[PDB]
Ligand SMILES: O=C(NCc1cccc(OCCSc2nc[nH]n2)c1)c1nc2ccccc2c(=O)[nH]1
Ligand SMILES: [Ca+2]
Ligand SMILES: [Ca+2]
């Protein structure tokens with residue numbers, strides 16, 4: 608027999624993602640680089656592996672949409688809600704949605720896609736919000752300006768998946 612696990616987490620280390628569509632704001636290459644870097648934040652400190660799929664069904668389906676986009680979490684136009692992600696699980700589980708009424712960038716302007724993606728993927732992997740104002744998983748976006756994952760987030764993700772290779 609099997610009972611359901613204690614926390615919401617992926618039960619496998621090999622995860623897939625798919626970039627379903629793309630924002631007008633950035634080149635395809637910029638978007639791809641941003642997401643690749645965002646996943647690397649988490650794989651660098653766990654045993655998790657992330658592989659991109661070009662089509663079909665991936666664990667983490669990534670898309671850009673506006674207003675009603677196919678779930679119970681409609682977007683709201685410019686500002687306000689910017690993105691959301693589902694905790695680990697089937698179908699919707701793990702998926703990450705970005706509000707395409709926001710301005711997404713590879714800079715300090717608008718919302719930096721890498722930074723928001725890294726936060727959202729934290730949710731996709733089973734982290735909720737932190738109370739540490741310096742954490743990646745703090746609930747309020749601030750662009751501070753070499754990226755290092757804060758210790759609070761390291762401790763959080765490793766509580767779920769272990770450290771993988773520590774060196
Ligand atoms: O801003 C930072 N972290 C918090 C954050 C990020 C993204 C979105 C956020 O909030 C989104 C709205 S809450 C929501 N809505 C739906 N899901 N979750 C909040 C940050 N961390 C860093 C950590 C290390 C180095 C630099 C930085 C840096 O430069 N910035
Ligand atoms: Ca919005
Ligand atoms: Ca999914």
Ligand SMILES: [Ca+2]
Pocket residue numbers: 630631632706707708709710711
């Ligand atoms: Ca946009």
Ligand SMILES: [Zn+2]
Pocket residue numbers: 676677678680681691704
């Ligand atoms: Zn959504």
Ligand SMILES: [Zn+2]
Pocket residue numbers: 726727730736746
């Ligand atoms: Zn969040």
